[PDB]
Amino acid sequence: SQQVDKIKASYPLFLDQDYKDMLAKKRDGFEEKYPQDKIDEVFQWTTTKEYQELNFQREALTVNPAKACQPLGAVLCALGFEKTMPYVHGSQGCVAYFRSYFNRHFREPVSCVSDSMTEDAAVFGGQQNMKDGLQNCKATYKPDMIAVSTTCMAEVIGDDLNAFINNSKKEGFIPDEFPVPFAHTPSFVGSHVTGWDNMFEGIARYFTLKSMDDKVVGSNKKINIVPGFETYLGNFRVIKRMLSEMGVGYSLLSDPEEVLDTPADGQFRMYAGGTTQEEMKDAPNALNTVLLQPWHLEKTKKFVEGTWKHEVPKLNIPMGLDWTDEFLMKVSEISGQPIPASLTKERGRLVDMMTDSHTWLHGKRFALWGDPDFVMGLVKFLLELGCEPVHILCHNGNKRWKKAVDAILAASPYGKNATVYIGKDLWHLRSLVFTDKPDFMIGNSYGKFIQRDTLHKGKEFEVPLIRIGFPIFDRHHLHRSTTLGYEGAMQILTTLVNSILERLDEETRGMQATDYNHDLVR
């Protein structure tokens, strides 16, 4: 039933007595459900050290992974180029998923096509798909460039992207001059960030490999910036802002910030802004190339150094105070531009915030996850804040990265009770936050289900989630935030300290029980 002036959606409708009774009858009548006491018993067991040890002996089973697949990253990279259509050669199921996954995080349109390879192409290949696909895409969506990746079907059957694209041009399906950079993006190798790197190196190749003869390092007086797989609009913005403030010439290679933030003004814009083909053609003429996320830009790095002859500086992602400082100092060195007064002041304002908030942050324990560069920056900043990054999980991390993070931990007293995990998933992490409970998790939306599980053990075991990462599906507009630079550090500090004070207010809100500490001033 409904009262027409107070209509109930699923929650709390199904809490009405008649739905409750109905649901009880279904259970008892037809579900052959395990008794509740047995359910409680198994649940408590999954919270144990014993269960954790079995959980960590898994070899074949992954549960609640914290990574996606290559072509996802290839798509996001391609979206950052002017009037460019990402095109995934292979099966169409994939593209519906890529688009939806990004739609949900950005609450924006996400344009991407497939050439709809079916079981027939599985035995004669997808060459015809590529011919008609490229022609159809170009004519229907009028892109100035089509950036081609692959789904795992196309990888397994072995379709030769280069030859198929060359033949499409040869047989007149698209003009010879029409740019169609490509990359093989096998989902069974690495992760979404690997896809990004592969796609980016492929585009750089396409526009520079055969034209190096007339290039001269430094001749355009600019610095190239490669952002990597990046899902916060504020991160593209903060980089350009700081470089502009410095008077530094730069070229941001792969820049989706416009096409992922079009105005609702009565028209749909399929494409907006983005890196130009010219910028890619001319990138070898830069003074140098800075990688914002070096731990998933390895292929790109080899090409930039091997072919462009740039001497890519050894720089961490610019997160936190020390690493933003180093980034700016390196840019200053390369460009001959002093760090302006404005950035120096912003820096001091961040430091001021750290001094204001340090007493609530001190000693706070966190479990966290994400992509390797993001995770290491978050770890770094946490130490800068006097927090303990106790459970550090990077599903797509590697041995070399883990060593690096481990050294950053060792260099601080706050890293003493921290462990870095690679190859582990959120079901591993779930055990850790039960057996060695932190104060909070910093992670993506999948973390909410871990918070749920912890509260079921008890309120005093609940570990609240603080949403920073990708994907964030269950809050609105966090994708507008910033995690890089001083601006990003300020945003993270503010979200951390306030999540702490929120939870304290919750724990002290009980009248005549815990409200002696329900302070007006904190």
Binding site: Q2, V4, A9, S10, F14, L23, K26, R27, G29, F30, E31, K33, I39, F43, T46, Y51, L54, R58, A60, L61, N64, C69, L72, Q92, G93, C94, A96, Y97, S100, N103, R104, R107, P109, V110, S111, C112, V113, T118, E119, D132, G133, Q135, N136, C137, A139, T140, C152, M153, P186, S187, F188, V189, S191, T262, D265, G266, F268, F449, D453, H456
Partner: protein, 477 residues
């Protein structure tokens, strides 16, 4: 907008396509004539999508794992292959259930074999067996396992059928192999079929010769309701207030035991014909259980359905049918009185999957609204046969519509409201056209039943008449 104008809209839009695509797409666009009883004579469907045109369709894995099998709550479903499919489809569909997630229910979890190169080169069957053992250890209360194949599995010549048989016998466990690889078929649709066949071959027969269940003359199964936002619960409650006993729900909030018991029922009540007509036809042929189609969208269709269903039983059921109908009358009437005046005459375009593009038309019409355009991602001609009588004359129909097509249709037709999916939503919002998600119910619902109609009405109104829509033009133009 007349039939002349729609046929010419179609022609103009088609003018951008290259020769081959133009000729294809032309066959998948039509202007309705409710005369036509053989849709075949005016539109074609269930064909391959043209490359590069941005179809909105998914794959057979979406159809099997995301749609049919995923909702079964007390089984563990393995996304078998690389890490993508299982992660993009993790908890995106609101197939609601009651359970203790991670302990006796697993619906929102993503279990996966996370294929690596060594698995592609040497096969994943050994990994799968080991994965099964690890599942049994860490999830002891699971009541069965399904293996949902992603693209690579068949391509590389793995044999999940054999792994399932062998491990099933070793552990005395129901392990269902599903060859739902996304390269198969042309859309989600073949995934349903494949998944229906899997249920039939590996689960449905389990209690064929078993008589312990105490049956009644009033036993029914709800077939093809995935309980989106609780849709099946708000359907179930009505059937049971009518005196029926709902033995099974396929598969929203469904249990493996419910599935196994379904061959004991007296009547299969089919909501989603597209996804589950296959298994329904099977149950009729093998157990002699008849099945009928019904519709719980809006008071008119719900009332009609309760009556049709009751007629299959006896006077005591037909009597309670009228008692339910009388009970809810004042409720849905107050909903109509409140919201119809706010929606009367408004025009809607729909694009959804294989059922709702026709099935919701009645509910829109119970609020005085007009569906001036509809279409399906993956429907077959028997769906279009059912559609052309539900749609008005000279309305626009589109099959496997392209992103280009849908945008251009909307620009000319200028609907007051569009109901479609997540890949469409943000496009039309920018164009200043109110948009409701008609897969996910935009995180609202249920929409099924009398109780769902209230939410449905509230939702269409809140969005269609929202203050935000008058603000898209800056007053300085």
């Amino acid at each position: 907008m007349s039939r002349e104008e729609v046929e010419s809209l179609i022609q103009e839009v088609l003018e951008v396509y290259p020769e081959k695509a133009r000729k294809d797409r032309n066959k998948h666009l039509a202007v309705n004539d409710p005369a036509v009883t053989q849709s075949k004579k005016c539109i074609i469907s269930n064909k391959k999508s043209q490359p590069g045109l941005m179809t909105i369709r998914g794959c057979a894995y979406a159809g099997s794992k995301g749609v049919v099998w995923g909702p079964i709550k007390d089984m563990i479903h393995i996304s078998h292959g690389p890490v993508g499919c299982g992660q993009y489809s993790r908890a995106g569909r609101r197939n609601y259930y009651i359970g203790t997630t991670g302990v006796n229910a697993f619906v929102t979890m993503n279990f996966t074999s996370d294929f690596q190169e060594k698995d592609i080169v040497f096969g994943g069957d050994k990994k799968l067996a080991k994965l099964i053992d690890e599942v049994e250890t860490l999830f002891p209360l699971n009541k069965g396992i399904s293996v949902q194949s992603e693209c690579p599995i068949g391509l590389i010549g793995d044999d999940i059928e054999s792994v399932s048989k062998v491990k099933g016998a070793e552990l005395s466990k129901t392990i269902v192999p599903v060859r739902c690889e996304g390269f198969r078929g042309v859309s989600q649709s073949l995934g349903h079929h494949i998944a229906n066949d899997a249920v039939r071959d590996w689960v449905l027969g389990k209690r064929d010769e078993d008589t312990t269940f105490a049956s009644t003359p009033y036993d029914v199964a709800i077939i093809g309701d995935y309980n989106i936002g609780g849709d099946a619960w708000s359907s179930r409650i009505l059937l049971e207030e009518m005196g029926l006993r709902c033995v099974a729900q396929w598969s929203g909030d469904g249990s493996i035991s419910e599935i196994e018991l379904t061959p004991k029922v007296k009547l299969n009540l089919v909501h989603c014909y597209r996804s589950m007509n296959y298994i329904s036809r099977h149950m009729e042929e093998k157990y002699g259980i008849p099945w009928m189609e019904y519709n719980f969208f809006g008071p008119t269709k719900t009332i009609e359905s309760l009556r049709a269903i009751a007629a299959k039983f006896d006077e005591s059921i037909q009597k309670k049918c009228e008692e339910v109908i009388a009970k809810y009358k004042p409720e849905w009437e107050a909903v109509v009185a409140k919201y119809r005046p706010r929606l009367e005459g408004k025009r809607v375009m729909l694009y959804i999957g294989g059922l709702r593009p026709r099935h919701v038309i009645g509910a829109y019409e119970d609020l005085g609204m007009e569906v001036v355009g509809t279409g399906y991602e993956f429907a077959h001609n028997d769906d279009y046969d059912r559609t052309m009588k539900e749609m008005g004359d000279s309305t626009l129909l589109y099959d496997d519509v392209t992103g280009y097509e849908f945008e251009e249709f909307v620009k000319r037709i200028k609907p007051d409201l569009i109901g479609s999916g997540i890949k469409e939503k943000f496009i039309f919002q920018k164009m200043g056209i109110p948009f409701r998600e008609m897969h996910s119910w935009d995180y609202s619902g249920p929409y099924h039943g009398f109780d769902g109609f209230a939410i449905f009405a509230r939702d269409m109104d809140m969005t269609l008449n929202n203050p935000c829509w008058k603000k898209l033009q800056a007053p300085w133009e």
